[PDB]
Symmetry: D2
Subunit: 352 residues, 4 copies
């Protein structure tokens, strides 16, 4: 089997791997639709996770099960499934603590394109199929379903961490695909006013579609000053960080009111320290909670997000601005995430 | 002044009262729109809370401030306000515990038509105006605004108590006005599948409008078997009780899965005991949490729900099936709530 | 292999079974100390879980690993271990929801003396050793360690469910071994006043040792009136049910103040319905939360309770009023559990 | 009244007895205690410039006069006065954050926006909401630890979200940290690792439940704790002292999914550092909380029950007891010089 892989830092290319074999609890999946992510770019060209050699990229996929182990019971060859980006080992002490995202170590729940070959191949390996796969209903299109493995679960997690009360005012810092799902997530938690911060017009339109009531362009002035004018000095009840540099952490604390919550799902890939402003954090005593979490994975997380799409609570197809067909177009879609045109949100490659 | 009052258990009529006088922190409001509730029916004709004498009924009103105390700071005569059904004293020990609904004793946060003259009069008294009143934006119609004081905050409270996770399956037992707002609340908490139980078609249509994906009519068979068939034996993650007799508590426990939650906002006016089925409650060990709460009130609760209506997260005007004009039609609206025609959800009397 | 077994409903005795074989993830353990439970009595003489034939009884044991499967990684033959009473399958959807006690179905986390042979034999089988075993420190005596598998985790779970705030007043209804650990748990959650309800003097003395500040004997009058007099009408912030018939549920609701919590760990083995008093539950609106849960199990739960004993946070050896030596005295300890002398709390059998 | 004359200058002034509102009460102090906050206010300008402001915010006094609407307190009652006496009729109270009632940290009024307790009398706003009766069985030197030290340290333990048997590290074993050590024990902590150096504080930490002592004499705190937990880290870290860098140490020693609970007051620097890598680059589920201590009547009543029913003995914090109004100055000066055998000084006035 072939696979679009990271040869080394700054280099990508196709490689031939021996098709993987499933353990007694594992499954082999061929992809029906894949999507590249900004994480793949940070991994290859910035060394976000360190040095990697000959590692197939990609972690957002929808596929068909072709082979299962002798102990796999809920999945058989021919089943269309949604594969979460996080496929942890479910038999660790961190799972018994309630944090499967860190099963076996910090962020160790994320295996694809990290500690194992990713989904950008003719086949890929899923560990613990009965715990890390969810059946895909036929009524959900592939381009919509491939938004569930990473974009939907991450953005919604930012809304979960934000501890949104009914009618609260929420700010979403960054309206990329994750941020757009955070806006939709904030709406799904009963937020009243949703202030979205971003500039790209294609993102602003998608943000309004998902529930944003105000748009703050960080080109029209400082984010902090704009939001304080919108909220008439009250600030926001919660801020969801879905993009930006390390400085955006300071912006979030400044706009959240005392007792509120700063929920980060953004990946800070550079800098030794994330700044927390001393005065705006009450010198340590303002009850401004700061959370930061990896997206949940596993079967149950996927099944619940599938129900949200199935019952028309959120339509993630607005994230898909580019659709390609064919295994070869994985490279072009990946290079699109590196160039990042102003009309791109998320590209999807459809496979035979 | 005039006011539709409870003469005794089973008797209602107009009575003559002394126009109320405000304390230094209080406000006098004349009603602009009022709505009767089922609670008044349980109070008068079932003796659910005991004997009352010449107590003006009603607790759902949008009004105009006509007089304020010397220490009221945020409200002046002429301000259109939304008056929460629950107007507690905010300087008690129960408020410091986080349960203002029971400020001064069980259910003591609910004063109108309970321990104080209600809103069905030419004027009524609001205690602690700066803490128990919210300004009404011009953009919200009166017939919609009067759904906020009680119907919206109660139904949404059922959804809050239910501890709904994103994509969870929620059953709403009873789709009267409170149940319909519980359906809307469940959607606002990110519920996927929402199973609504009721029979009246006007309620069924409203349930579908507010987010119900399935309708269970308790005329077509036992509720438990229908819901267990719908969920393929899994049960529901949460059940919100918004109507029915004491037996509906047993129905809720039977359909909620182990680890789920039964959230009751229904007001049981008859029976000595609410039944909890032993076996289906795991003989005490199934982790099926049972909650039951009076609706939140106060200025902040009203302001947050106003933002939900203002930013078009929920449209409560669909609850209003009958609109009348005039003090005389308060009697007609109250009696409609006693007979409950098959086409009634919520009546509103406009006093423009 | 010898084993004390439930022959049928109402009959027990020693039988010879084929020594069990471990699966690749399992372990074979020989017991060093065991304890009978009230649950074993309900199973044999009341048919609580139905008819059983030649099922070895017992679920509280501390032992030595004698054999492990090829995939067990943290335990080798010779390791002294604490075996939790609940040894669930850790690869189910209920584990992903956070309720391992119901892994595979209601209460299905409890396997010993239910769906598999218990610990009252020369050897027993532990499923998923790396997830369901904890190492036993040498400094902890066997008679103390064998209180961890069930009594400590159940009683402490009652304290966890009660949502105890620092300085709150907690009542524990029933001071058997589980109730005594609920008293200790309430102290470990920062309870101020702890009112323990019981009659047997050996139980009263243990309750005082574990932190009880007041003793209510239900022979001196109704529990409700006694507790309301002690708290001067305030009631308690939480009530932990650790014993009694179904009527104790109504008693619990009557003494808890509005906004409090009723946390049940008791096993109700009789009655079709557990009564919840309508009026004292606020007619459904008193914010009196009712919880009821099976005890937590698994490796992490045992390791944490082991640390509580190791670092001298709780001494469970005071629960042990009878210690016998010898494999044969399992019969005497089990029968002692049925006769219930006034000086008995928990008996322990030491082996070899 | 012992007052802050200006930045760096203090002295006795004119006892202009305060007047109570209809809901307020005038209390004369029976026992007071100075805090590091009093020192930061005067000599570092922590809250800005003040003129003729009576200092002090930890006092157990007796109410001598009440307003016409005070119902639960009469002249002659011995009460515990919390350091935080917020206005209870604001929107932040309806959100559940009375410490910020009317603005960030606005729940703390004594020695901030009103004269403190180091005077012949002081003014307590909303007596029925900000006062608690003091049982006779509780000694004064023990009771005066409740208004600030006990409620702060216990708040650090509350914010930490401690599960039964969890491993908790307390960074800093001053009076607040010592109460955080006792608080973690009250929340069911198993192993409690205390970080500090002064011997009188180390002995108190073991008394309140600390199972390990990490001294910066044997190496960096991060390396020591990782060896103690054999690389597992701790489930929660309560920050009760140190510079801004202690925030980075806290993140490094807490395991993924744990909690950093800060009650420390950071008075210098523009930014508190959160280490990127050890915070999972933003995704390690290491929650960071930081809150002002709770106040009000209920908070005091709950902590009084803990002392009354002998759940915690705060008298071990009191290393020096003085008698007389004049020794308020000497006790205040101890907090500035900080002897190595001092934890908390108390001035008895009854
Ligand atoms: N926690 C998890 O499990 C998880 C999962 C997936 C991804 N992530 C990470 O979360 C982040 C989300 O990125 P993405 O997938 O949504 O694609 P993206 O296009 O890179 O998102 C960046 C968004 O933030 C905007 N932005 C840049 N700087 C900003 C600033 N100072 N303030 C406000 N907005 C700013 C960008 O607008 P402009 O075009 O003007 O720059 C854009 O709208 C990534 O870093 C990703 O690696 C985390
Ligand atoms: N917690 C609070 O603060 C608060 C506030 C306001 C009201 N309440 C109370 O909550 C309840 C809500 O009533 P409402 O105002 O929404 O008007 P409602 O029309 O009386 O609500 C009754 C609903 O329950 C249904 N019902 C009756 N018996 C049923 C059964 N065996 N099984 C299933 N459904 C059954 C009814 O079915 P049909 O469609 O056939 O009629 C209807 O859908 C009332 O008791 C009210 O007093 C509480
Ligand atoms: N949730 C779980 O996972 C779990 C685990 C283990 C056990 N359990 C069950 O929880 C219960 C705990 O029993 P145990 O192991 O602690 O032994 P136990 O000695 O049988 O406990 C009975 C206690 O409850 C008292 N009691 C009986 N009726 C009472 C009444 N009307 N009012 C007040 N107290 C009353 C008893 O009073 P006296 O002092 O007069 O006897 C005694 O103190 C058992 O039913 C057990 O099967 C549950
Ligand atoms: N959130 C609130 O409401 C509240 C209330 C009261 C006070 N506070 C503030 O919280 C802090 C608690 O201070 P305190 O009253 O308990 O007296 P303190 O003596 O100042 O407590 C400081 C503790 O931290 C130690 N320390 C200093 N640098 C350290 C470092 N790099 N690493 C580890 N430990 C270090 C100190 O050692 P030494 O023994 O050598 O000094 C001492 O043990 C103060 O800053 C206070 O202003 C907050
Ligand atoms: C950190 C990593 C988690 C899973 C997939 C995301 O894109 C990035
Ligand atoms: C009631 C029973 C359930 C599991 C734990 C022990 O076996 C007791
Ligand atoms: C900031 C200030 C709050 C109340 C009293 C404490 O000592 C410190
Ligand atoms: Cl496995
Ligand atoms: Cl006031
Ligand atoms: K907060
Ligand atoms: K489905
Ligand atoms: K539950
Ligand atoms: K508005
Ligand atoms: K409650
Ligand atoms: K140990
Ligand atoms: K956390
Ligand atoms: K007391
Ligand atoms: Zn991705
Ligand atoms: Zn009503
Ligand atoms: Zn047992
Ligand atoms: Zn202080």
């Amino acid at each position: 089997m072939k696979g679009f892989a990271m040869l080394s830092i700054g280099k990508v290319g196709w490689i031939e791997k021996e098709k993987p074999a499933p353990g007694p609890f594992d499954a082999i999946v061929r992809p029906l639709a894949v999507a590249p992510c900004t994480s793949d770019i940070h991994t290859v060209f910035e060394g976000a996770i360190g040095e990697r050699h000959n590692m197939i990229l990609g972690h957002e996929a929808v596929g068909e099960v072709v082979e299962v182990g002798s102990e796999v019971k809920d999945f058989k060859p021919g089943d269309r499934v949604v594969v979460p980006a996080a496929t942890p080992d479910w038999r660790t002490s961190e799972v018994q603590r309630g944090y499967h995202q860190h099963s076996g170590g910090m962020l160790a729940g994320w295996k694809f394109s990290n500690v194992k070959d990713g989904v950008f191949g003719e086949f890929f390996h899923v560990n613990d199929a009965d715990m890390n796969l969810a059946h895909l209903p036929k009524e959900i299109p592939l381009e919509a379903a491939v938004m569930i493995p990473d974009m939907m679960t991450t953005g919604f997690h930012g809304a979960e961490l934000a501890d949104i009360e009914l009618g609260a005012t929420v700010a979403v810092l960054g309206i990329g695909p994750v941020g757009l799902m955070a806006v939709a997530g904030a709406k799904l938690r009963g937020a009243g006013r949703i202030i979205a911060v971003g500039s790209r017009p294609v993102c602003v339109d998608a943000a309004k579609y998902y529930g944003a009531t105000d748009i703050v362009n960080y080109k029209d002035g400082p984010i902090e000053s704009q939001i304080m004018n919108l909220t008439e000095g009250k600030g926001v009840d919660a801020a969801i960080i879905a993009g930006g540099n390390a400085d955006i952490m300071a912006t979030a604390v400044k706009i959240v009111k005392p007792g509120g919550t700063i929920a980060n799902v953004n990946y800070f890939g550079e800098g030794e320290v994330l700044p927390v402003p001393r005065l705006e954090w009450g010198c340590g005593m303002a009850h401004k909670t700061i959370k930061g979490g990896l997206c949940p994975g596993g079967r149950l997380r996927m099944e619940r997000l599938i129900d949200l799409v199935f019952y028309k609570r959120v339509d993630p197809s607005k994230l898909v601005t580019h659709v390609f067909r064919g295994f070869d177009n994985i490279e072009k879609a990946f290079m699109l995430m590196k160039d990042k045109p102003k009309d791109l949100i998320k590209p999807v490659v459809i496979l035979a």
